[PDB]
Amino acid sequence: MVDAFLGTWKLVDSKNFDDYMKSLGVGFATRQVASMTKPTTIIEKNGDILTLKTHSTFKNTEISFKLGVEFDETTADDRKVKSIVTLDGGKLVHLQKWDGQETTLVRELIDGKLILTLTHGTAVCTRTYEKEA
Ligand SMILES: CCCCCCCCCCCCCCCCCC(=O)O
């Protein structure tokens, strides 16, 4: 049900990522490098386990999860969170919880592009990824 999300994706547009990072308490120097970084996101499946890799010249991350089953995660900015990823309205919705805080990472396909919407506090960031062959 997730299959159109699978593959290798490259960042091609970013709006309000600094706002999002600052809301999370990321320091200025990290925000500065991150603002010029273009990650590659690789989404693969093996049975109902999904692996999501984010690779860049700055930070790399990898998570594996079953849809609808909570997992522990340590984010790129070193938050230790309780996470769950589900399909909702055809969107891949990743909710992270820690210290009573929450943030959502929502992925939706629009005209073949992967749109990642990141919300924390009032900050709303929209990052667009395009498929690599
Ligand atoms: C792994 C590369 C992530 C993007 C560059 C480094 C950012 C580090 C500080 C902010 C981390 C916030 C949580 C992760 C944001 C992921 C954004 C994305 O996948 O495009």
Coordinates of N, CA and C and ligand atoms in Angstrom, one line a residue:
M1 N 0.9 -1.2 0.0 CA 0.0 0.0 0.0 C 1.0 1.2 0.0
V2 N 2.2 0.9 0.4 CA 3.2 1.9 0.4 C 4.1 1.9 -0.8
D3 N 3.8 1.3 -1.9 CA 4.8 0.9 -2.9 C 5.2 2.1 -3.8
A4 N 4.3 3.0 -3.9 CA 4.7 4.2 -4.8 C 5.8 5.0 -4.0
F5 N 5.9 4.9 -2.7 CA 6.9 5.6 -2.0 C 8.3 5.0 -2.1
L6 N 8.4 3.8 -2.5 CA 9.7 3.0 -2.5 C 10.6 3.6 -3.5
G7 N 11.9 3.6 -3.2 CA 12.9 4.0 -4.1 C 13.8 5.0 -3.5
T8 N 14.6 5.6 -4.4 CA 15.7 6.6 -4.0 C 15.2 7.9 -4.5
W9 N 15.3 8.9 -3.6 CA 14.7 10.2 -3.7 C 15.8 11.3 -3.3
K10 N 15.8 12.4 -4.1 CA 16.8 13.4 -3.8 C 16.1 14.7 -3.5
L11 N 16.6 15.5 -2.5 CA 16.0 16.8 -2.2 C 16.1 17.8 -3.3
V12 N 15.0 18.4 -3.7 CA 14.9 19.4 -4.8 C 14.2 20.7 -4.4
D13 N 13.6 20.8 -3.2 CA 13.0 22.1 -2.7 C 12.9 22.0 -1.2
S14 N 13.2 23.2 -0.5 CA 13.0 23.2 1.0 C 12.5 24.6 1.5
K15 N 11.4 24.4 2.2 CA 10.7 25.6 2.7 C 10.6 25.5 4.2
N16 N 11.1 26.5 5.0 CA 10.9 26.6 6.4 C 11.7 25.5 7.2
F17 N 12.7 24.9 6.6 CA 13.4 23.9 7.4 C 14.1 24.5 8.6
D18 N 14.7 25.8 8.4 CA 15.3 26.4 9.6 C 14.3 26.6 10.7
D19 N 13.1 27.1 10.4 CA 12.1 27.3 11.4 C 11.8 25.9 12.2
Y20 N 11.7 24.8 11.4 CA 11.5 23.5 12.0 C 12.6 23.1 13.0
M21 N 13.9 23.2 12.4 CA 15.0 22.9 13.3 C 15.1 23.8 14.5
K22 N 14.9 25.1 14.3 CA 15.0 25.9 15.5 C 13.9 25.6 16.5
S23 N 12.7 25.2 16.1 CA 11.6 24.8 17.0 C 12.1 23.6 17.9
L24 N 12.8 22.7 17.2 CA 13.3 21.5 17.9 C 14.6 21.8 18.8
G25 N 15.1 23.0 18.8 CA 16.2 23.4 19.6 C 17.6 23.1 18.9
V26 N 17.6 22.8 17.6 CA 18.9 22.6 16.9 C 19.7 23.9 16.9
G27 N 21.0 23.7 17.2 CA 21.9 24.9 17.3 C 22.2 25.5 16.0
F28 N 22.6 26.8 16.0 CA 22.8 27.5 14.8 C 23.7 26.9 13.8
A29 N 24.8 26.3 14.3 CA 25.8 25.8 13.4 C 25.3 24.6 12.6
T30 N 24.6 23.8 13.3 CA 24.0 22.6 12.6 C 22.9 23.1 11.7
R31 N 22.1 24.1 12.0 CA 21.1 24.6 11.1 C 21.7 25.1 9.9
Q32 N 22.8 25.8 10.0 CA 23.5 26.5 9.0 C 24.0 25.4 7.9
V33 N 24.7 24.3 8.4 CA 25.1 23.3 7.5 C 23.9 22.6 6.9
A34 N 22.9 22.3 7.7 CA 21.7 21.6 7.2 C 21.0 22.3 6.1
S35 N 21.0 23.7 6.2 CA 20.3 24.5 5.2 C 20.9 24.4 3.8
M36 N 22.2 23.8 3.7 CA 22.9 23.7 2.4 C 23.0 22.3 2.0
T37 N 22.5 21.3 2.8 CA 22.6 19.9 2.6 C 21.4 19.4 1.8
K38 N 21.7 18.5 0.8 CA 20.6 17.9 0.0 C 20.7 16.4 0.2
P39 N 19.9 15.9 1.1 CA 19.9 14.5 1.4 C 19.3 13.6 0.2
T40 N 19.7 12.4 0.3 CA 19.1 11.3 -0.5 C 18.3 10.4 0.5
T41 N 17.0 10.2 0.2 CA 16.2 9.3 1.1 C 15.9 8.0 0.3
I42 N 16.2 6.9 0.9 CA 16.0 5.6 0.3 C 15.0 4.9 1.1
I43 N 13.9 4.4 0.5 CA 12.8 3.7 1.2 C 12.7 2.4 0.5
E44 N 12.8 1.3 1.3 CA 12.8 0.0 0.9 C 11.8 -0.8 1.7
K45 N 11.3 -1.9 1.2 CA 10.5 -2.8 2.0 C 10.9 -4.2 1.8
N46 N 10.7 -5.0 2.8 CA 10.9 -6.5 2.8 C 9.8 -7.1 3.6
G47 N 8.8 -7.6 2.9 CA 7.6 -8.0 3.6 C 7.0 -6.8 4.3
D48 N 6.5 -6.8 5.5 CA 5.8 -5.5 5.9 C 6.9 -4.7 6.8
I49 N 8.3 -5.0 6.7 CA 9.2 -4.2 7.3 C 9.8 -3.1 6.3
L50 N 9.7 -1.9 6.7 CA 10.2 -0.8 5.9 C 11.5 -0.3 6.5
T51 N 12.4 0.0 5.6 CA 13.7 0.7 6.0 C 13.8 2.0 5.3
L52 N 14.0 3.0 6.0 CA 14.1 4.4 5.5 C 15.5 4.9 5.9
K53 N 16.3 5.1 4.8 CA 17.7 5.7 5.0 C 17.7 7.1 4.5
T54 N 18.4 8.0 5.3 CA 18.6 9.4 4.9 C 20.1 9.6 4.9
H55 N 20.6 9.9 3.7 CA 22.1 10.0 3.5 C 22.4 11.4 3.1
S56 N 23.5 11.9 3.6 CA 24.0 13.2 3.2 C 25.5 13.4 3.5
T57 N 26.0 14.5 3.1 CA 27.4 14.9 3.5 C 27.5 15.4 4.9
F58 N 26.4 15.5 5.6 CA 26.5 16.0 7.0 C 26.1 14.9 8.0
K59 N 24.9 14.5 8.0 CA 24.4 13.5 8.9 C 23.8 12.3 8.0
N60 N 23.8 11.1 8.5 CA 23.1 9.9 8.0 C 22.2 9.3 9.1
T61 N 21.1 8.8 8.7 CA 20.2 8.1 9.6 C 19.7 6.8 8.8
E62 N 19.2 5.9 9.6 CA 18.5 4.7 9.1 C 17.5 4.3 10.2
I63 N 16.3 4.0 9.8 CA 15.3 3.4 10.7 C 14.7 2.2 9.9
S64 N 14.3 1.2 10.7 CA 13.5 0.1 10.2 C 12.2 -0.1 11.1
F65 N 11.1 -0.3 10.5 CA 9.9 -0.4 11.3 C 8.8 -1.2 10.5
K66 N 7.9 -1.7 11.3 CA 6.6 -2.3 10.8 C 5.6 -1.2 10.8
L67 N 4.8 -1.0 9.7 CA 3.7 0.0 9.8 C 2.8 -0.3 11.0
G68 N 2.4 0.7 11.7 CA 1.5 0.6 12.8 C 2.0 0.0 14.1
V69 N 3.4 -0.2 14.2 CA 4.0 -0.8 15.4 C 5.0 0.2 15.9
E70 N 4.9 0.6 17.1 CA 5.8 1.6 17.7 C 7.2 1.1 17.7
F71 N 8.2 2.0 17.6 CA 9.6 1.7 17.6 C 10.3 2.8 18.3
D72 N 11.5 2.4 18.9 CA 12.3 3.5 19.4 C 13.2 4.0 18.2
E73 N 13.5 5.3 18.3 CA 14.3 6.0 17.3 C 15.2 7.1 18.0
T74 N 16.3 7.2 17.4 CA 17.2 8.3 17.8 C 17.4 9.2 16.6
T75 N 16.9 10.4 16.6 CA 16.8 11.2 15.4 C 18.2 11.8 15.0
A76 N 18.2 12.5 13.8 CA 19.5 13.1 13.4 C 20.0 14.2 14.3
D77 N 19.1 14.8 15.0 CA 19.4 15.8 16.0 C 19.5 15.2 17.4
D78 N 19.6 13.9 17.5 CA 19.9 13.2 18.8 C 18.8 13.2 19.8
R79 N 17.5 13.4 19.4 CA 16.4 13.1 20.2 C 16.1 11.6 20.3
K80 N 15.8 11.1 21.5 CA 15.4 9.7 21.7 C 13.9 9.8 21.8
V81 N 13.2 9.2 20.8 CA 11.8 9.3 20.7 C 11.1 8.0 20.5
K82 N 9.8 8.0 20.8 CA 8.9 6.8 20.5 C 8.2 7.1 19.2
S83 N 8.3 6.3 18.2 CA 7.8 6.6 16.9 C 6.8 5.5 16.4
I84 N 6.0 6.0 15.5 CA 5.1 5.1 14.8 C 4.9 5.6 13.4
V85 N 4.8 4.8 12.4 CA 4.6 5.2 11.0 C 3.3 4.4 10.5
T86 N 2.4 5.1 9.9 CA 1.2 4.5 9.4 C 0.9 5.1 8.1
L87 N 0.0 4.4 7.3 CA -0.6 5.0 6.1 C -1.9 5.6 6.5
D88 N -2.1 6.9 6.1 CA -3.3 7.6 6.5 C -3.7 8.5 5.3
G89 N -4.8 8.2 4.7 CA -5.2 9.0 3.5 C -4.2 8.9 2.4
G90 N -3.5 7.7 2.3 CA -2.5 7.5 1.3 C -1.2 8.2 1.6
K91 N -1.1 8.8 2.7 CA 0.2 9.5 3.1 C 0.9 8.6 4.1
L92 N 2.2 8.6 4.1 CA 3.0 7.9 5.1 C 3.2 8.9 6.3
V93 N 2.6 8.7 7.4 CA 2.6 9.6 8.6 C 3.5 9.0 9.7
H94 N 4.6 9.7 10.0 CA 5.6 9.3 11.0 C 5.4 10.3 12.2
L95 N 4.9 9.7 13.3 CA 4.7 10.5 14.5 C 5.8 10.2 15.5
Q96 N 6.5 11.2 16.1 CA 7.5 11.0 17.1 C 7.1 11.7 18.4
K97 N 7.3 11.0 19.5 CA 6.9 11.5 20.8 C 8.1 11.4 21.8
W98 N 8.3 12.5 22.5 CA 9.4 12.5 23.5 C 9.1 13.6 24.5
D99 N 9.2 13.4 25.8 CA 9.1 14.4 26.8 C 7.7 15.1 26.7
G100 N 6.7 14.4 26.2 CA 5.4 15.0 26.0 C 5.2 15.8 24.8
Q101 N 6.3 16.1 24.1 CA 6.4 16.8 22.8 C 6.0 15.8 21.7
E102 N 5.6 16.3 20.5 CA 5.3 15.6 19.3 C 5.8 16.3 18.1
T103 N 6.1 15.5 17.1 CA 6.3 16.1 15.8 C 5.9 15.0 14.7
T104 N 5.4 15.5 13.6 CA 5.0 14.7 12.6 C 5.8 15.0 11.3
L105 N 6.1 13.8 10.6 CA 6.8 13.8 9.3 C 5.9 13.1 8.4
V106 N 5.2 13.9 7.5 CA 4.2 13.4 6.6 C 4.7 13.3 5.2
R107 N 4.6 12.2 4.5 CA 5.0 12.1 3.2 C 3.8 11.8 2.3
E108 N 3.7 12.5 1.2 CA 2.6 12.4 0.2 C 3.1 12.5 -1.2
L109 N 2.6 11.8 -2.2 CA 3.0 11.9 -3.5 C 2.1 12.9 -4.3
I110 N 2.7 13.8 -4.9 CA 2.0 14.8 -5.7 C 2.7 15.0 -7.0
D111 N 2.0 14.6 -8.1 CA 2.6 14.7 -9.5 C 3.9 13.9 -9.5
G112 N 4.0 12.8 -8.9 CA 5.2 12.0 -8.9 C 6.3 12.5 -8.0
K113 N 6.2 13.6 -7.3 CA 7.2 14.1 -6.3 C 6.8 13.7 -5.0
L114 N 7.7 13.5 -4.1 CA 7.6 13.2 -2.7 C 7.6 14.5 -1.9
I115 N 6.5 14.8 -1.3 CA 6.4 16.0 -0.4 C 6.4 15.6 1.0
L116 N 7.4 16.0 1.7 CA 7.6 15.8 3.2 C 7.2 17.0 3.9
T117 N 6.2 16.9 4.8 CA 5.8 18.0 5.6 C 6.2 17.7 7.1
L118 N 7.0 18.6 7.7 CA 7.5 18.5 9.0 C 6.9 19.5 9.9
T119 N 6.1 19.1 11.0 CA 5.5 20.0 11.9 C 5.9 19.8 13.3
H120 N 6.3 20.9 13.9 CA 6.6 20.8 15.4 C 6.3 22.2 15.9
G121 N 5.5 22.2 17.0 CA 5.1 23.5 17.5 C 4.2 24.2 16.4
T122 N 4.5 25.4 16.1 CA 3.8 26.1 15.0 C 4.5 25.9 13.7
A123 N 5.8 25.5 13.7 CA 6.6 25.4 12.5 C 6.1 24.3 11.6
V124 N 6.0 24.7 10.3 CA 5.6 23.8 9.2 C 6.6 23.9 8.1
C125 N 7.3 22.9 7.9 CA 8.3 22.8 6.8 C 7.9 21.9 5.7
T126 N 8.1 22.3 4.4 CA 7.8 21.5 3.3 C 9.0 21.2 2.5
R127 N 9.4 19.9 2.3 CA 10.6 19.5 1.6 C 10.1 18.6 0.4
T128 N 10.6 18.9 -0.7 CA 10.2 18.2 -1.9 C 11.4 17.3 -2.4
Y129 N 11.1 16.1 -2.6 CA 12.0 15.1 -3.2 C 11.6 14.6 -4.5
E130 N 12.5 14.3 -5.4 CA 12.3 13.8 -6.7 C 13.0 12.5 -6.9
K131 N 12.3 11.6 -7.6 CA 12.7 10.2 -7.7 C 14.0 10.1 -8.5
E132 N 15.0 9.4 -8.1 CA 16.2 8.9 -8.8 C 15.9 7.6 -9.5
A133 N 16.4 7.4 -10.7 CA 16.3 6.2 -11.5 C 17.0 5.1 -11.0
Ligands
LIG1 C1 20.0 12.8 7.8 C2 20.0 14.2 7.1 C3 18.9 15.1 7.7 C4 18.9 16.5 7.1 C5 20.2 17.3 7.4 C6 20.6 17.4 8.9 C7 19.6 18.0 9.8 C8 20.0 17.9 11.3 C9 19.2 18.7 12.2 C10 17.7 18.5 12.1 C11 17.2 17.1 12.1 C12 15.7 17.1 12.2 C13 15.0 15.8 12.1 C14 15.2 15.1 10.7 C15 14.9 15.9 9.5 C16 14.8 15.2 8.2 C17 14.6 16.0 7.0 C18 14.6 15.2 5.7 O1 14.5 14.0 5.7 O2 14.6 15.9 4.6

